[PDB]
Amino acid sequence: FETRFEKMDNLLRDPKSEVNSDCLLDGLDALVYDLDFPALRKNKNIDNFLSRYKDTINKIRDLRMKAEDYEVVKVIGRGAFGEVQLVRHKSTRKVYAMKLLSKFEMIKRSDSAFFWEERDIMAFANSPWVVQLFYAFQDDRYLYMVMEYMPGGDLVNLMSNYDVPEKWARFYTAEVVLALDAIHSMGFIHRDVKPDNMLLDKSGHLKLADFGGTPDYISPEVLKSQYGRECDWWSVGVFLYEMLVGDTPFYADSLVGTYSKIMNHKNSLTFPDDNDISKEAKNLICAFLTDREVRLGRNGVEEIKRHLFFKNDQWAWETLRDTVAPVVPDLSSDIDTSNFDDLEEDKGEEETFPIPKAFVGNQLPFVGFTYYS
Amino acid sequence: ETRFEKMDNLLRDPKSEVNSDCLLDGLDALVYDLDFPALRKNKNIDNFLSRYKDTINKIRDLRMKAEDYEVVKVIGRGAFGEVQLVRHKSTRKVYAMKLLSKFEMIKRSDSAFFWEERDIMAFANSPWVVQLFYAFQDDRYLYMVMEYMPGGDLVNLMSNYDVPEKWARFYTAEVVLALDAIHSMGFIHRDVKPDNMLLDKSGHLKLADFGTDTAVGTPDYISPEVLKSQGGDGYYGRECDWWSVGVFLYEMLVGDTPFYADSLVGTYSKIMNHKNSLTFPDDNDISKEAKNLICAFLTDREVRLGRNGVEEIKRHLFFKNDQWAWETLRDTVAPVVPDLSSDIDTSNFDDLEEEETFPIPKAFVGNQLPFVGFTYYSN
Ligand SMILES: COCc1cccc(CC(=O)Nc2ccc(-c3cn[nH]c3)cc2)c1
Ligand SMILES: COCc1cccc(CC(=O)Nc2ccc(-c3cn[nH]c3)cc2)c1
Ligand SMILES: [Cl-]
Ligand SMILES: [Cl-]
Ligand SMILES: [Cl-]
C-alpha cells in the first residue's frame, strides 16, 4: 500500500505512458477548450469550473510549448491536412522542420487518428536512420510536430537530378534497410515506403520520415485484397530498381496497366538491354519483387544484410553512417532550402469547428499528443 | 528551460491546482461524466472512453479509495454527509473520515464550501488545527481523512461539566492561539463554535473547520457584520472570529448563548441590537475580568478587542494566571484528560447508526466538475 505511490509516480514520468504529466495536462487543456462556449457556460457546473481554472489554464498555456515560440522562415511542404514549415525557435535560435496538422480538417473528415504512429515512430525510434521528433504540442486548432531539419531534401529530388550508379544505390538502399529495421523493431509497419519519405541530412545521409497508397510502389498482395513487414520490403525493391534503371519496374500510362504489370510481376519485371546492372543487384531486386510467401524480408533484416549486393570495400554495416555520402549538400546557411521547392505561407483565417450548442468533445481525439524531449 | 522547470514545480507542488492529483481528477471526472449510452452516440466521446478505459481502471485501483478503510463507527452526521471512525485496512491506524455526498451538494446547489476546510486542515501544519492526511473521491463522495480527536468536542464537554473560570481561561486561550494560527495563513474561520473545537488524546484543543439557516448554519455565533454581509451589506475581516470567541466564553460561563431566542429572526435581531440585548443574569458568579473580556469581544468591529491584533487579546487581565504562560500553554496539563479504553474509544461522541444517485444524463451535465482538484496525498 506504500508501493502504489511509487507505481503511480512511474506512470506520470514514463514518456510512453497514457497518464504521464503531458497527457494529464492535455486532458485539462482539452476539457477547458471543449467547455468554454457561451451556450455551455449557461450550465452552472461548467461555468464555475472554467472560472475556477481560468488563471491556472492561462498560466499553463503560457509555460507550455506553443506556436508563438517559433518563427516561420519558409513553407517546405503542404498537404490535405496541413503543412511543413522551416521554423526557428525564438529563444534558442535553433532551426527545425515543423509539421502542422489541422484539427478542423481531421475532425471534418472523421480522420483523426493517423498521426499517432507518425508521432511515436519519430519520438521513440532513437535511430541514426529515423527523423527525430523533438517536440509535439497542440492548441485548439492544430497539432505540431517539431522535427530535425533535413536540408538535403528527398530521394525523389535526388533521383530526378542524378543517374544513380550502383555504388550510390548500395549506400541509399543500405540506409533504408537500417531505417526500416528500426521501425519494424518497434512493432510498426511503415505501409508507404517511397522516395518521398527518404530525406537527406547536412552530411547527405538518409533518414526515414513517416507519413502518407501510391500505384508504382504497391505490392501484389495489396492489389488482390481490395499484411506483414513484407509489403515494406516490396517497396525497397521498387526503389532499388528505380534508382538503377531510371524508371519504376511496373510503369504504365494508366492506373490499370500498372496494377496488371504488378500482378503479372513474374513476367512484367524486366531489366533493359541498355543497362549494365550487376548480377547481385538484379538478385536483390528480384528477391524483393516476388510473392509475399518467398520474399526477402519475411525472416528479418539479417538475411537482407547478408546479401552479396551489400558486399563492398568502402563500408561495413557498423561504419555505414561514418562514410562520405555520395551527394553532400553545400548549405549557405541554417535556413538554406535550395533542396526543396519553396512554397508560400498561407496567412488567411481558416474555418474552425461549428460552435457547440452542447458538449461535443472535438479536442478528445488529440489528448496525449504532447511530447517533450 | 526555466518554463520546463516551472511546469515541473507546478506538477509536484501540493498547493498547486495543476499538480498530478488534480490532473488525474480531471481525467477521472471526464470519464465518469461522459460514460453514458446517449453520450457515446458521439464518436469523439465513444472513442475517448474506449482509448482511456484500461488506464482509468488501473488509476482508480492504485489511487486511494473508500475500500482501503474499514468503518468502525459513525461519530458525526450532517446535511451533506457523515463523519466515521475508520481503520486503514493495511496499516491498521485509526482515523476520522468525513464523507460529503456529491448528490446532495449538487441538489442543494452547495458544492464549494469544502475548499477552505480542505486547505486549512491540509496546510496549517499547526498543533492548533486538526490535520487532514488524505483527501480523495469517487463518483458518489468526497472523503477527508483526518487525525482522530478522541476527547470529543466542546459541546459535549459543556454538557458534561459545569465549567469553572480556570477551565474557561484555558479553552479560550487555546481557541485564541488556534485562530491566530488560521489568521496567519490568510484565512477567516467564519465557523467558530464549540462544535468545531475538538480535544486530542491529551485534552488539548484543535480547531476543525465546518458549518452546522441555509448559508450561515447555526446563527448564535454569527457577528453583526457577517450577518449584514449576507445580502451585500458591507464586508467583514478576521475580527469576525473574535466576536465568536466572546459568544463561546459567555456560553461556557453562563450556560446559554448571549443572544438566544426561539426563532432565527429573534436571534438575528438580538445580535444586531447587541448593545441592549447583551445581559448577564442576576445570579452573577462571573468575575469582573471575565465580563470585561466578553464585552470587549461582543461589540462593533470598529472598537472590538480583535482589532489591533492578538497581542491585545493576550494582554487582557482575564488571562492572568499561575498555571501557564502563552508560550507553554500547550505543554500544561489540560483540565479534562480523556481516559481511553482503546484506539476505537468513542465514549466522548454521541451514538450514531436511502442513498439517492444522479439521474442518467441525456447530454453532458458535468456533475463531477465542481470536485476536480479535491484529491490530496500527504506523503
Ligand atoms: C497529408 O496531410 C498532412 C501533411 C501535410 C504536409 C506534408 C505532408 C507530408 C510530409 O509529412 N512531408 C514532410 C515531412 C517531414 C519533412 C522534414 C523533416 N525534417 N526536414 C524536413 C518534410 C516533409 C503531410
Ligand atoms: C453539513 O455538511 C457538512 C458536514 C457533514 C457531515 C458532518 C459535519 C460535521 C462535522 O464535520 N463534524 C466533525 C468534524 C471533525 C471530526 C473529527 C476530526 N477528527 N476526529 C473527529 C468529527 C466531527 C458537517
Ligand atoms: Cl442568448
Ligand atoms: Cl543516434
Ligand atoms: Cl558522416
Residue numbers in the entry:
A (entry chain A): 7 to 218, 236 to 249, 255 to 401
B (entry chain B): 8 to 219, 232 to 372, 377 to 402
What's the publication's text?
We apply this method to identify inhibitors of ROCK1 from almost one billion commercially available compounds. To facilitate further validation of the method and confirm the postulated binding modes, we obtained co-crystal structures of ROCK1 in complex with Compound 1, the most potent inhibitor identified in the virtual screening campaign, and with Compound 22, an inhibitor we considered structurally unique. The crystals contained four monomers of the ROCK1 kinase domain in the asymmetric unit, of which chains A, B, and C were relatively well defined, while the fourth copy of chain D was quite poorly ordered and not used in analyses. Focusing on the chain A example in each structure, the resulting electron density shows a clear binding mode for each ligand.
Examination of their docked poses revealed that they contained a phenyl group distal to the hydrogen bonding N-N pair of the pyrazole. This phenyl-pyrazole moiety fills a similar volume to that of the purine group in a native ATP-bound kinase structure. The structures were solved and refined to a final resolution of 2.34 Å (Compound 1) and 2.74 Å (Compound 22). With the Compound 1 example, the pyrazole nitrogens that bind the hinge motif are 0.8 or 1.0 Å apart between the experimental structure and the docked model, while the alignment of the protein atom component of these hydrogen bonds show 0.4 or 0.6 Å separations. The mid-ligand phenyl linker ring has a distinct tilt in the experimental structure, but the overall ligand position remains co-located with the docked model. Since docking protocols generally do not account for such large conformational changes and protein dynamics, the consistency of the experimental and docked ligand poses in this example are all the more remarkable.
